[PDB]
Write a protein that binds this ligand. Structure first.
Ligand SMILES: O=C(O)c1[nH]c(=O)[nH]c(=O)c1F
Ligand SMILES: O=C(O)c1[nH]c(=O)[nH]c(=O)c1F
Ligand SMILES: [Zn+2]
Ligand SMILES: [Zn+2]
Ligand SMILES: [Zn+2]
Ligand SMILES: [Zn+2]
Ligand SMILES: [Zn+2]
Ligand SMILES: [Zn+2]
Lengths: 363, 363
């Protein structure tokens, strides 16, 4: 017996196009998404060129429309020059992304005052998400309060961070957050196996106590999102390993295994991969869209999953229970048992759908 | 004609006793204070051993009572073990000091949750001050709001920081701050002259734009405080230079020069070296205490000032106008024209005076 799930949403993926297409592109990354039971993705802006102005967004929209196999929305990225310049295109994006820790020069913000300027100028009804680690979580929460609006914290990875967010929620502050599978299923204990290159990710892998704390505070976690961050094995194993793990094809099987073990319920999972992403990012429903999974099938994660161009996975060797058998997207069979059956270009920009615009008060 | 000033207060000094007495001790540091027109100092807890428990505070109190030539209060320091343990001695301290950036292991806090624990456990009516740079200012402000209390930010050194504090004040948040003379009178432009060892300080010297921003936002600055942080020249010029400048003997002459140039008023100076320190730290008046200064005398800062054991100064070569001529402390001549005339042990712990206890609601 298969279980029918709604179309799942991953609000944090790096699809590398334009400019890093040896690592992934829209066509390969969305194939990976479909194989992982994901029917809608939100793509991050740290491409080359980065999506930090209207022309770069226009290019990205066309590349995505031509290459995506599932539906999508594209983030804009905050820079040190673009506050106050994104108003005309803001509503067409998934949201605004702030890189508040390590990143490349084009997306670096040198001062908290620049964070404030973005919070003040970005339209108040549209999402803002932040890469914010450790004390940076508290700092960006302060900026959000000074500017009287909400913020969403990406990939919470530490006991310190989830407890801070928990305290903020207890005070009624408008903050939401997401957690990535590697911060729930890997830890320092895995670094010996992974090695120093493969093991590089930001936020870094946590201690057993960090992992435990995330599970214990599941009530505080609004969304799961992969932070799919593909790089090739050559890059990961080289002299300057870039941070990041591929994760679209492994996320749902890992979480289904946890459901099967009673670590969280099926509903807990669907709140975090469907309902909460929809409501935080104002993402529209997908008509005639669903995922069929087999919860009984036991398998071992191989050295690489079929679709991502990363061609490696840090979860190699983990035993899982649960598999995606079929995906239907807008009334077409998109995936069955290892075969993707919708072409590049089948996917659409959900922000262009009437039901995908974020509601706002008139001027 | 001399101008009579009230007894000035420096709320941020490192007097190095116990454990670093080759750099300074209570007797030498308070001699330096008196020579700088300061009659009351608040001493930081990063001594060896650090002042992080009741026994260390008891030792420090006796060393200060025996060695101090001016009056004083002693900070307690926050550690990763002492939250919830300082209640019985808290009221006897100047306040609680949090080192939120670089420091030695005993005072290191590894998580924002530890900051929260201190804000929750330290008595709500007593001062908390923080070494908090750049985004750490925003982070500690968030913790203060979550716990519904005030915080004082030490040595604000950057445009970024003073503008964040300005924004917080505009929102009615209970935050105050201090600025050190080196962040008003030195900048990157001075690093060539100082060299990489002498130039080491935390917070680091700022750009011309940082310095300009502090002056332009003088209204945001509640206090001046030296961050007197003495180290010997051997240490500063060695292979592992410790951060810090001596500053007690140079602070007032630098600021008097600025007053003479119309950069701030005499009142602006006295708010920041007398009234605001009193009211933020609940420090008592000193009876029969005053400082006489000569505002006309032009001199050049030498390679070392007479009293601090640091025996060097980063202000060497600067031209100043204004000199301390006489200090009277509690009815005794304490300093005249280069001679200290009160012995070690003349100074008293102001928190033991009836008028020096911080008022609180009964239990
Ligand atoms: O794009 C990436 O590879 C990347 N990888 C990471 O591990 N963290 C990031 O914040 C990121 F932007
Ligand atoms: O004690 C010191 O020397 C010291 N020196 C600095 O330059 N900054 C500090 O925060 C500090 F504690
Ligand atoms: Zn990130
Ligand atoms: Zn995210
Ligand atoms: Zn990411
Ligand atoms: Zn400091
Ligand atoms: Zn201070
Ligand atoms: Zn200090």
């Amino acid at each position: 017996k298969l279980v029918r799930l709604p179309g799942l949403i991953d609000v944090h993926v790096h699809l590398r196009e334009p400019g890093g297409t040896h690592k992934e592109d829209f066509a390969s990354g969305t194939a990976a998404a479909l194989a992982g039971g994901i029917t809608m993705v939100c793509a991050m802006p740290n491409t080359r060129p980065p999506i930090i102005d209207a022309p770069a967004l226009a290019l990205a929209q066309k590349l995505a429309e031509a290459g995506a196999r599932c539906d999508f929305a594209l983030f804009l990225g905050a820079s040190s020059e673009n506050a106050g310049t994104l108003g005309t295109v803001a509503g067409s994006a998934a949201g605004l992304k702030l890189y508040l820790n390590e990143t490349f020069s084009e997306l670096r913000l040198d001062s908290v005052v620049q964070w404030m300027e973005h919070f003040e100028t970005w339209p108040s009804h549209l999402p803002i998400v932040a890469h914010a680690e450790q004390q940076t979580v508290a700092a960006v929460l302060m900026v959000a309060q000074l500017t009287q609006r909400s913020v969403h914290i990406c990939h919470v990875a530490r006991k310190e961070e989830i407890l801070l967010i928990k305290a903020a929620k207890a005070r009624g502050l408008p903050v939401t957050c997401e957690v990535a599978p590697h911060h729930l299923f890997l830890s320092h204990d895995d670094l010996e196996r992974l090695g120093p290159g493969k093991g590089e990710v930001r936020p870094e892998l946590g201690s057993r106590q960090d992992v435990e704390a995330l599970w214990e505070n599941m009530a505080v976690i609004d969304c799961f999102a992969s932070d799919h961050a593909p790089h090739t094995l050559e890059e990961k194993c080289g002299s300057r390993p870039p941070p990041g793990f591929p994760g679209l094809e492994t996320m749902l099987p890992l979480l289904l295994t946890a459901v099967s073990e009673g670590r969280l319920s099926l509903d807990d999972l669907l709140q975090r991969l469907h309902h909460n992403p929809r409501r935080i990012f104002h993402l529209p429903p997908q008509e005639d869209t669903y995922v069929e999974v087999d919860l009984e099938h036991e398998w071992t994660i191989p050295s690489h999953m079929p679709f991502s161009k990363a061609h490696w996975t840090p979860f190699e060797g983990q035993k899982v229970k649960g598999t995606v058998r079929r995906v239907v997207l807008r009334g077409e069979v998109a995936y069955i048992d290892g075969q993707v059956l919708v072409p590049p270009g089948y996917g659409q920009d959900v922000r262009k759908w009437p039901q995908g615009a974020v509601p706002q008060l008139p001027p």
